[PDB]
Structures are given as C-alpha cells and as structure tokens.
Amino acid sequence: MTKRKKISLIGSGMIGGTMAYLCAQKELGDVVLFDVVKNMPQGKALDLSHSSSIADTNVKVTGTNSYEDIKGSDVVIITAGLTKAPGKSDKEWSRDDLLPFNAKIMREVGENIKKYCPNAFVIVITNPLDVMVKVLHEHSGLPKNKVCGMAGVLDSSRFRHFIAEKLNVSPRDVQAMVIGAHGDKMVPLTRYVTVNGIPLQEFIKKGRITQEEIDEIVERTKNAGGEIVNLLGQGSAYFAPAASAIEMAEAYLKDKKRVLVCSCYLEGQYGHKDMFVGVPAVIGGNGVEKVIELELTPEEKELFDKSVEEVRKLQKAIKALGLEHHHHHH
Amino acid sequence: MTKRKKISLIGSGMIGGTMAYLCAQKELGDVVLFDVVKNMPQGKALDLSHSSSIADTNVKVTGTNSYEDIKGSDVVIITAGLTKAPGKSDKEWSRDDLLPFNAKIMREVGENIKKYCPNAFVIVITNPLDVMVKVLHEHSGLPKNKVCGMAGVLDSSRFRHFIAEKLNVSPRDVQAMVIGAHGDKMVPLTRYVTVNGIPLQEFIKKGRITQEEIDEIVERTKNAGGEIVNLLGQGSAYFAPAASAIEMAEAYLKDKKRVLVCSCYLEGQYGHKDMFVGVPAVIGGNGVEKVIELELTPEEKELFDKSVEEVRKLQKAIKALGLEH
Amino acid sequence: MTKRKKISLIGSGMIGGTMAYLCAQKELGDVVLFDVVKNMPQGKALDLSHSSSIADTNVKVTGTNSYEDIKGSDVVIITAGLTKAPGKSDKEWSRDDLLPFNAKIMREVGENIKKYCPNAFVIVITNPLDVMVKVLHEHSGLPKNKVCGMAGVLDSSRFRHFIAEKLNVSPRDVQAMVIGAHGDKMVPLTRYVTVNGIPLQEFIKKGRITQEEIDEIVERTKNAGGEIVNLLGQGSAYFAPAASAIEMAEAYLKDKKRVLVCSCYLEGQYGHKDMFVGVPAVIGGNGVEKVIELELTPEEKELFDKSVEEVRKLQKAIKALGLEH
Amino acid sequence: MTKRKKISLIGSGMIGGTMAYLCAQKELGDVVLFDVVKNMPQGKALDLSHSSSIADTNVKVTGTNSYEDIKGSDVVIITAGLTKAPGKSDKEWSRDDLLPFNAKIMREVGENIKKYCPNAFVIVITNPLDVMVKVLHEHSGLPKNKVCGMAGVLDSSRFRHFIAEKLNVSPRDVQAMVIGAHGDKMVPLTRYVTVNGIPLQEFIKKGRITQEEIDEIVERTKNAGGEIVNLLGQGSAYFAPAASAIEMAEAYLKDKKRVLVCSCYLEGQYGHKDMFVGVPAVIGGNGVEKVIELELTPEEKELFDKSVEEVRKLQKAIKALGLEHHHHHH
Ligand SMILES: NC(=O)C1=CN([C@@H]2O[C@H](COP(=O)(O)OP(=O)(O)OC[C@H]3O[C@@H](n4cnc5c(N)ncnc54)[C@H](O)[C@@H]3O)[C@@H](O)[C@H]2O)C=CC1
Ligand SMILES: NC(=O)C1=CN([C@@H]2O[C@H](COP(=O)(O)OP(=O)(O)OC[C@H]3O[C@@H](n4cnc5c(N)ncnc54)[C@H](O)[C@@H]3O)[C@@H](O)[C@H]2O)C=CC1
Ligand SMILES: NC(=O)c1ccc[n+]([C@@H]2O[C@H](COP(=O)([O-])OP(=O)(O)OC[C@H]3O[C@@H](n4cnc5c(N)ncnc54)[C@H](O)[C@@H]3O)[C@@H](O)[C@H]2O)c1
Ligand SMILES: NC(=O)c1ccc[n+]([C@@H]2O[C@H](COP(=O)([O-])OP(=O)(O)OC[C@H]3O[C@@H](n4cnc5c(N)ncnc54)[C@H](O)[C@@H]3O)[C@@H](O)[C@H]2O)c1
C-alpha cells in the first residue's frame, strides 16, 4: 500500500509535543516523538493518542528513546537542545549562549538521520538556529535543498501579527517578511509589508499608522522572543514556533509551493554562499525548491549583510568546537 | 439560548446549492434554500441534509418556496435570476443582457428583506452585479454598510489563480485585486500584484514572467466569465462564485476584518458617490466597515472611472425600466 | 519527490464536479475531471481552480476528454452514466432502468483503467450500483480489494439523518447502517442503530421515538433516492453521493481503517460469493481490507438474501447484454 | 454588531494554554487566559496570538490577572487548581488528595462568575472533578444546566482509543462510554461499546478481541491518568483533557446536540439527586439539555452506585471544609 506520511520529532519537549498535537489535529501523518529523556515521550504520545480519538483523526503517535524508530520518515523536525543557558537571568537571555550546548546534539542527530532516514526533509528549530542548521547539514550528508531552519516563518508571523493588530485587519491579509539571522540582527522588511498587496506606505499616508508606530513594531518583532521569555518565566515560546515548523512541513508533504522565509543554504544568492540564513524560498516536494532573491535596496542589503556577519561570527565559534565526523556511526 | 447563525440563500440553483454545501461542510449556520421553483429547493435540502450527516456537522437545511422562511436571517445571499439572456448565443453572452429580467427580481427580494429580515447582512450575486446590488439596496431599505455585491473576490481569485499558475507558487501567497465593475471594464490592478508582498515587477525583472504574459493574464481575467460560459454550454460559473460569497459571509459572521474587494456603496471615495462598484473593503461584523481608497495612479484612476461609467450606463436602463434611477 | 495524490473523476457531471470541489476544499490531491462531453470538464476545472485559490489550497484541477489523463491515478471515482432512463417518468424512476445504458460505459472505463492506472483504488457510483461495480471490476482486471461501490455510506447517511432528526441529536452520534443492494430491497438495520452505542431500543422504551416512526424512517430511507428525483425534477441526488465517495477515498488515501458500508466483492461472507453487494467493510490503504460479517438474525439474513437476489436478477440482464455474466 | 464568541479560561497552565491553542486553531472565539500568576498568561497570549497569524485565523487572545476581564463570556472553562499534592510520590498520585487545595479556589472562581458572567456555560476541569463542579455550582448561583464537569469525554476517549487500537479501526468508528465518578471507580461500559453500532461482543465471538483483552482495556482506562502521570514525571495529561473540554464547548457554542458523557447535576436520574456525576447527556445551546438514563443492568447499576458513593464520600470532606458564601463579593 502507500503508507501514511511519517513525521519524526527529534526532541519531545514543549515545541516537540505541540507539533505532535498539530499533526494529530490536522491528521498530517503518523508521528514519532523521540527524546533522550526516558518515559516522557511515551507519556505525551499516550495523551496525544487519546486526543486523536477526540479529534476523530487517524494518527499513530509513538514515543521513543531509540533513533532507529525514525526510519523512513518523510519529515524530521529537530528541537533537541537547551532553551536557556544556565546562570543567566531571563532579561539577559541570548540564543547565542546556547551554542556550545546544542552543536554536539546537532552532530548526533545528523549522524542518525544519515543512517536511518537520509531521504527525509529536515527542519531544524534548535538555537542558535542558523548555525545549528549548518551543523546538522554537515553531519547528516543530506542534500542542500532537503534541510532548512525554521525562523523566518515565526519572525514574520510576529511582524504580521503586530501590523495586523495595529491596522485592525485580519492577519491573513497582511504580508510581512523578516529575513537574515534569527536573532537581534534579523531584518523586518518594512518596505515589503502589504495589506492584500497594498503597500503599508498607503496606510501611513492615510494616517492609519505612523512611521513611529512601524518603527516600534520592527523593534518589537526583533525582541519578541525575549519578550515572551521574560513574561513566561520558564522556557521560551512554543505555540507559534510549533505552528511555523508545521506550516513548513505541510508545504513539503503536499508539495504546496508556499513562499516562506526559512534559513536556507545559499549558493551565491545575496552575495553569499555556504551558509544557511533566512531568506524567502519556495517550499514544495523537493524541499527548498528556490531561494528568492529580493531586489533589496542598498540600505536593506547592508542590514542583511550585517545579519549574515552575525552568522559568520557564530560559525567561527562552531569551528572552534572542532567536531569530528563518524562520531556515533558514520 | 444563543441560536445558531441563520443564512438564507435566495435562489437555490447552482450557486445557491453550492453555497449551502459549503455552509454544511463548514458548519456555518442553519441554511434556508429559497426558490420560486416548487419542490426543487426541498429536494436539494434533503440531499444537503444527508451530506451534513456524512460531514459530521450540525446544520439544519430547509428548502422552501415561501419568503417567510427568511425571517430572522443573519446573512442573506441572493442568486435569484437568469444566467443567460433568452434568445442570445453563448458567444455573445453578456451580463448586461440579464438586466431587464433580474432587476425586477431584486425589487421583489428587497421588499421581502425589508419586512422579514432587515437586520441581515446581504450579499448580492445576481448579474449584472453592480446595478443589481443597487436595486436590492434601494428597495430593501437596508443601511449602506449592510449590503454589498460579490464580484471582486471572484475576479481577484481568477487574477490570483492565473498569476500563481504562471509563477508556480501557491495562490495563498499571491495577492491580486480586480476593482471596478464586474464586467468587461473590470480593472485587474497589475501594479498591486504581490507574491507575499514582493512586487510582481521583481519577477518580471528576473524573467520569471514577461510583461506580455501579464497582459495576457489581465485579459484572461476580464474574459474569464464568458470563457467558462462558452466551455460549460449550460449556465455560468458557480464553484468559485459560491466560495467567494461564503468567504464574505464568514468575514461578517465571525467579525474577521478581511480585506476583500466587493461591490460597495460609495460615499465620495475615488471621487464617486451613490453607486455600488468594486473596491477593496474591510468586512466584519458591521458589514462593509471601511472602503479603502487606493492611491491609484492617473492611468489606474482613468481605468477605474471608465469602469464606473459602465455602471452609470447600466443604471440608465434601470431608471428606464421604472426600477429606481 | 513524492508527488501529490492524483484523483481521477471519470464523469464530470453533478457528482463528479461536486467531488472535485470537495477535493479542492480538502486539498486531497490533484484532480482530473474526465468526460465525453467536449469542453464542459475544462470549464468546470477552470471554475474549480479559481475556487482553490479562494480556499487557499494547492490543487491542480485538469479537465479533459482523453482517457490518457487518468494515468497514474491513486484513486478513480466513476460517475459516468445516465441518471434517468430515456422515455420514463419521474414517478416511475428506477435505478434498474439505467442498466443497458450504463453497463457498456463501465466496460469502456474498465478497459482504460486496465492500461492507464491498474494500481488505482476504484470507487464506482454509476447506477444500478451493485451490478455496475461488477462490470467495472470484471473488465478492468483489478484485484477484488481494489474496487468497490459507493452506496451504503449514502444510504446509511440517510438512515442516520432521519433518526438523528427525530431524536434531535447530532448525526455524529448516530450509528446506522443500511446493507444489501442499493435499491428498493436495501436493508436498513434497525437493530444495529445506536446513539453513541446506546441501542435505539432504549429510546423506544422511553417514548422518545415510536416503532411506527422507525418503520416510517426505514421506508423513507429506502425511498430517499426516488424522493429526491421527484423533488428535483432534473437528475438525481449529488451532494451526499459526492461526500460519501470522498469519505471512502479519504479512507484509502490516508489508510484510515474506517468502518463503512460499501458494495464489496464477496468471497463466501453471508453465504454468498462472486457478486458485489453492500456490506460493512474496513477501508484503508489496501482498499477493502476486510468485509465484516454481521451476526444477522434469521429475519435479517432473509432480508439480506432477498437483497442479494435482486442483484442476481439484474446480473441476468448484464449477461444477456453480452457484458459478462 | 453580533460579536465573536468569548471564551474565558480560568487557569492558564498546561490545560488552559492548550485549550487556548485549540480555540486559535479552530477560530472558536476570542480567548481570555486568566491566572493568578503574574505575566505568564500574558506571555502565552502573545505566543498564541502569533500562532493565530500563522493559522490565518481571526482570534484575539488576552492574558489577564483580573477577573473583570471575563465579563460577557459565552463559555468559561476552569482549570484553576493544583495537579499533584505535595509530599506524594508519582506512583501514589490520587486526584482525591487535591480536594483541600482546590475547593476554596472553586468558591472564588464561582463568586467571580456570578459577578461578571452569570450567563456563561461553565465547564469545570479542576480535580477532584465531581465535587469541584458541585462547589463551583453552589458558589456561582448558575442554573443547574449551565454548569458541568469535563471527565467522561476524556475517560471515554481513552476507552475508545484502546479498543480502536486493538481492533485496528478508526476511533471515529468506535463508540465507548465511561460513566460515574472521575476516578478509580469510573465505570467503562463494556456492554455499550460498539463499532459503528456493531456490538463489541460480535468481535469477541469472531476472535478479533478476547474478553481477557477487554478486561485489560477496562482497567487501563481506569488507570490511564496515573499511567500518564507516571510517564511524564511532572504534572498530568493535558492534550486530551484540553481537547475534551473544547469538544464540550463547541457543542454549546454551536448548539450541536452532541451526546457526550459529562459530570452533570442529577435531579433523580439513576436514583440520585443533588450531586454531579458522569452520565451521558445532550449538550447544546441550553447547556446540559438532557441527562440520558441508560438502561443499566443491575450489575452495571451497582458499579455506578458505588461510583456515586465515592462522590458522596468526597462531598462529606467538602462539607467538613465549611465554606461561607459571599466571601469575595457576594
Ligand atoms: N460574480 C458574480 O457576481 C456572479 C454572478 N452570477 C449570477 O448569479 C445568478 C445565479 O447564477 P446560478 O446560481 O448559476 O443560476 P441558476 O440558474 O442555477 O439559479 C438561479 C435560481 O434563481 C431562481 N429564481 C429565478 N427567479 C427567482 C425568484 N423571484 N426568486 C427566487 N428564485 C428565483 C431560479 O429558479 C434558479 O433556481 C445569475 O444571475 C448569474 O449571472 C453568476 C456567477 C458569478
Ligand atoms: N448512491 C449511488 O451509487 C448514486 C449513484 N448515482 C448515479 O451516478 C451517476 C452520475 O450521476 P450524476 O453525476 O448526478 O449525473 P450527471 O448526468 O450530472 O453526470 C454524468 C456524466 O457522465 C458523463 N458520461 C456519460 N457517458 C460517459 C462516458 N463514456 N465517459 C465519461 N463520461 C460519460 C456525462 O456526459 C455526464 O457529464 C448516475 O448513473 C447516477 O444514477 C447517483 C446518485 C447516487
Ligand atoms: N525560532 C526558533 O528557531 C526557535 C523558537 C523557539 C525555540 N527554539 C529552540 O528550540 C529548542 C527547543 O525548545 P523547547 O521549548 O521545545 O525546549 P524543551 O527544553 O521543552 O525541549 C527540548 C528537548 O530536547 C531534548 N533533548 C536534549 N538533548 C537531546 C538529544 N541529544 N536528543 C534528543 N532529544 C534531546 C530534551 O530532553 C528536551 O525534551 C531550543 O533550542 C530553543 O532555543 C527555537
Ligand atoms: N479529567 C479531568 O477532569 C482532568 C484532567 C487533567 C487535569 N485535571 C485537573 O485540571 C487542573 C489543571 O491542570 P493543569 O495541568 O492545567 O495544571 P497547571 O498547574 O499546569 O495549571 C493550573 C493553573 O491554575 C492556576 N491557579 C491556581 N490558583 C488559581 C486561582 N485562584 N485562580 C486562577 N488560576 C489559578 C495556576 O497558577 C496554574 O497556572 C488540575 O486540578 C488537574 O488535576 C483534570
């Protein structure tokens, strides 16, 4: 027969479980919840199985501590890693501090994807996002188009939400993109914000929103992750991160050709190569099918290049870790 | 108790039945299917009721030949009318030719809404759309914000589909608007086409689409209705018209504040007043909450004004039939 | 790349177009609308394509007059055929009278499936359903588990709707099956009707429904198709038939293991073999995965056997037309 | 205008947030997330707002620490309370130990519903469920039909899932009910389990499932909550509890006339009155529109009555708490 789709969630914490719940609600495919922690993914998987019965969906949800259970996955979504570095206050939370904790996890996960599901589409969520996706790509041996990072869909959703709230319109009808690194140097593209294709500038000229208010929204978008960390007190955001990665997964599974901002492998676009960074892309059954090259103004391009320089600085730290290949398997 | 929403579909032909099906699938509210043809709406309502059981939804679908069954409707959607004028060929199909048959029907429907459901949000579909909506409005007594015509969501869906197909991207990510009259002088707004906010011009510059291809798509959008009439051989489009009207209805029922192009009563926007014509609008729980006045270029403004002039010409026929002015 | 599912709809009339609309709303897969009428499926496909843009779904809808476009289909759903026999009144409508017109069409469709998409799961709708499915199966060469007819989900949806309406509960919570032939000798299984597993008998005992009311509902279920034919005046039911077939298709495409009554090839269950007739079945990725043999009472068994005998009589006509045996 | 529906979630912890996410996904109405903990509901509400933008839904999600923000709620769902009593091991987890912690919370919540949204339909989740719903009803002054407890939909979903898994059929097609108290003396109604109306017994007679396997499933259903507590290590189940309460809310909001097992106020049915206990009911726009009286056999009825006696024993403990009315307002 043609089997249900199979989605493995490497990491069964807050984002992992929430993504599994979306998969159950949406009947996307069978789900494997993998974690290093014993019993917990099996417990969440039982709860999620019960929830599938309530939803009248037909979804097997399996919890596991064994990588071999990811064999034959169509999609793999990776959240394995730490959310907050120890000995740091909430207010000084930085994704950058997670780097030395999370890089070695990416190598392990990569080696296991290489062994058990080398044909999967792989979405990395673990921070610091743009360099974690590079480590994973390097150690997994996957095709450049079959690995990407979730960040832009989340950052863009934030930008959209804040603009839509201010204008009092449906967020369906706001288009907004945030490109570059997933961090403080992300680049919300104000000039590209539209309301059903109507430039945001029209609304400014009509006095429905001011430049000052837009500038505030751009900064709120940059700071949104930390805003939620400060309010929650434990961990980080999960409902929107989960939804963002599932939107990407959906695009792959059903070959939708969505235009989504993701951290993608560049091969010369925007003047850069051999790194992953946030750019608009077409996502379909071939994975990252196209990186779209925006006609950025010199000012936007300078912001983007400065963003990329933050990824290059993190990449130097990854190199200073020294990670050998074929550590776990080959 | 708070009751389910009640949606009355005045006209139970192709579009009306298809809209009822969406209401059953989406569990939007109870549905009244009204028509002047005896027994037909009752038959469709039984079929639709069976289909709600299959969908596991909770929807009463009532077919009727009596206007009294529209009492208390939250939303009324009007498709009553002819699709093709008697004695005309398919090749010469024109929405304008429907005018003398359908205008009288709008008057009658309006009179009934006025007594039975004056607080409804009313969506007109019957062609020729922009003048039909004005007849309905005038004879119903409804507030200007509580009546509109479905056209621009359909015309825009065509523009979006054709652009998305050429670019090979999801239509979710194509924004395209068509404003003006729902007819040959509709105005597909090429300058406003975006792919997730990215101007279509960027894709031209990169050679992903040519200006000639866009020009073809613009004309294909204008001609889409008659293309489908000629292909089908019977009637006219209905799957997309139904979905477009239901999108509008959902925006009202759930106070969504959608930005949708609809035929709206103008009160000076674009330099025009006291007609309905297609414009971007915010649709929510107060109906047409705002008409958005685009910063049209002089050339776009001219195209819009020539579109409005087609509505004004049709309105002269309405006045000459004794149906208002 | 793993491609989208491909669903071919052989017949692009009322049911075929409505099923395409569900596929577009539900984003089930790309759709091919095939018909012998030139240009009509192409027109509907354009309309449906526009409607997918409105739905924000990602669905190619292709209309065609060429069987070659069914190549590689995952699912094929067959509605090609007549709905009413020429020269008969509505009051005397009988599915049996369609047999000599529609049987030849099943042969032709089968021959094409055999070369172009022999690995498809095939759902037959064309009437008279139980014998049409057997002609298709025989001339297609498909495995017995890969072909079935849609009938029992529709008949059961009617039984469910009528019971749910009388009890004033959600039809989600009514389980009712109708087995046997899709015709006047269908068998609504009163003893198996439940409300969330609670036997209907409990509601009789409490006076929420009477035996006379149930008896009326049983007959209304049997007569439902012809009731809708008489009300509509044109054609026959389509909203519930479409939804029923799409429910079946979804069970296959997503390996759901739904328990649905379908016309299935019997291999000794109920004491019968080598015919298709309505039985409860588990539908999943291997098609008809299991026929469930109910513990019928002697009286129920007799009703089922008399239903099977109606299929056997129709099959004699099939043999006499030279279409198998 | 006719406003969106308004759903207030009193308690913004694991179940509360998860219910808010379902409301955002399903576009059920605007959501108020109330909690006594400062900042946390506001943080979750931001994350959920972002997720609504991703979902293309039109949902306002507000976090609050003020009861007045529940004014005009159509539905109120209460999870306010403790999940695990202190100083107890996971293996000895009991809903009964939560009683003295949670009763006073119910009085406070009730008094505020009375003041701010007396026309709401109220779904209680806080354990120990059947007596918490009684405390809430007593102190809120709501109509008997406008308050109920979520338990049976969850317990029944579990019974359904386990049966459906064993038979390898869609859980849509399994009907199973668990009635009585939400605890160890719940009563899974084996005789009423059906597969599209086909008695489970047919499947036993055909050898597709054994009585021994059914008996195991009945006990697994009784123990399911504790099973998940043991596996998770922290807190209790949330994905299915949330889904269960939203299914009940949906039934109300859209007047669906669903047949759902809920903890309902009895007025003589089953031989009992003036308590809430799990029974099948029709749920629609009038709330609990009908309690269905099953034709229980004497053996099933004995199990049900013993279940009710557990609720009566908890109720005596509630009485021994002594709670005065008009403590917070009136
Ligand atoms: N974008 C737009 O605004 C579109 C507009 N249309 C128009 O919508 C209208 C309906 O199209 P279809 O549903 O396809 O046509 P249809 O012919 O299938 O149905 C029209 C129904 O109106 C009924 N009707 C006629 N006079 C009536 C009366 N006084 N009251 C109640 N019902 C009455 C008829 O009996 C018939 O069932 C046509 O005028 C057509 O031109 C259609 C497509 C797109
Ligand atoms: N429960 C059931 O099994 C139900 C069965 N039916 C049956 O389904 C069939 C279709 O019903 P509708 O869609 O309402 O009819 P319809 O008349 O609207 O469409 C049938 C289509 O089949 C096409 N067709 C005829 N010969 C063909 C050929 N060789 N190949 C391709 N297409 C061809 C026609 O041109 C037409 O478009 C009828 O036989 C009807 O009795 C209908 C309702 C319920
Ligand atoms: N936009 C973004 O890209 C974005 C947004 C939010 C969170 N994040 C990141 O996502 C990651 C997960 O966040 P969360 O809230 O789900 O965290 P969490 O702490 O709730 O869960 C992470 C899980 O990873 C597991 N884990 C640790 N090591 C592992 C290993 N070697 N293999 C498998 N599992 C392992 C842990 O046991 C834990 O269950 C964090 O790195 C966080 O910074 C990124
Ligand atoms: N089937 C059932 O009925 C069922 C199933 C699961 C959980 N539960 C119960 O649901 C309740 C909630 O579980 P959870 O996992 O969401 O717990 P949780 O600890 O994650 O959240 C409970 C929240 O209640 C808040 N709270 C405490 N006192 C409050 C007050 N006076 N007002 C408002 N908020 C207050 C807390 O601050 C906390 O955020 C528990 O009592 C648990 O036993 C019942």
Numbering used by the authors:
A (entry chain B), D (entry chain B): 5 to 334
B (entry chain A), C (entry chain A): 5 to 329
Pull verbatim passages from the article behind this deposition.
LDH and MDH are homologous, 2-ketoacid oxidoreductases that share both a protein fold and a common catalytic mechanism. Both enzymes are found in central metabolism: MDH catalyzes the interconversion of oxaloacetate and malate in the citric acid cycle, and LDH converts pyruvate to lactate in the final step of anaerobic glycolysis. A key event in the early evolution of the Apicomplexa was the acquisition of a malate dehydrogenase (MDH) via lateral gene transfer from α-proteobacteria. Following a gene duplication event roughly 700–900 Mya, one copy of this MDH evolved a novel substrate specificity to become a highly specific lactate dehydrogenase (LDH) that is now essential to the life cycle of many modern apicomplexans.
In order to understand the structural changes during evolution that shifted the enzymatic substrate specificity of the apicomplexan dehydrogenases, we determined the high-resolution crystal structures of three ancestral proteins bracketing the key duplication event: AncMDH2, AncLDH*, and AncMDH2-INS. Each protein was crystallized with multiple substrates or ligands (lactate, malate, and oxamate inhibitor) and with NADH (resolution ranging from 1.35 Å to 2.05 Å). In the following, therefore, the descriptions of the models are primarily based on enzymes crystallized with oxamate inhibitor or lactate, which are highly similar. AncMDH2* is a strict MDH, and AncLDH* is a strict LDH. The ancestral AncLDH* and modern apicomplexan LDH structures are likewise highly similar (RMSD ∼0.8 Å for the loop-closed states), while sharing only 63–71% sequence identity. The first shell active site residues are identical in the AncLDH* and modern Toxoplasma LDHs, comprising the same residues as the apicomplexan MDH active site with the sole exception of position 102, which is replaced by Trp107f in the LDHs. The conformations of the ancestral and modern active sites are nearly indistinguishable, with only small differences in the specificity loop conformation. In both the ancestral and modern LDH structures, Trp107f and Arg109 are the only residues from the specificity loop that interact with the substrate. As in the modern LDH structures, ancestral Lys102 does not interact with the substrate but points away from the active site into solution. In contrast, Trp107f is buried within the active site, with the edge of the indole ring interacting with the pyruvate C3 methyl, which is the very chemical moiety that distinguishes pyruvate from oxaloacetate.
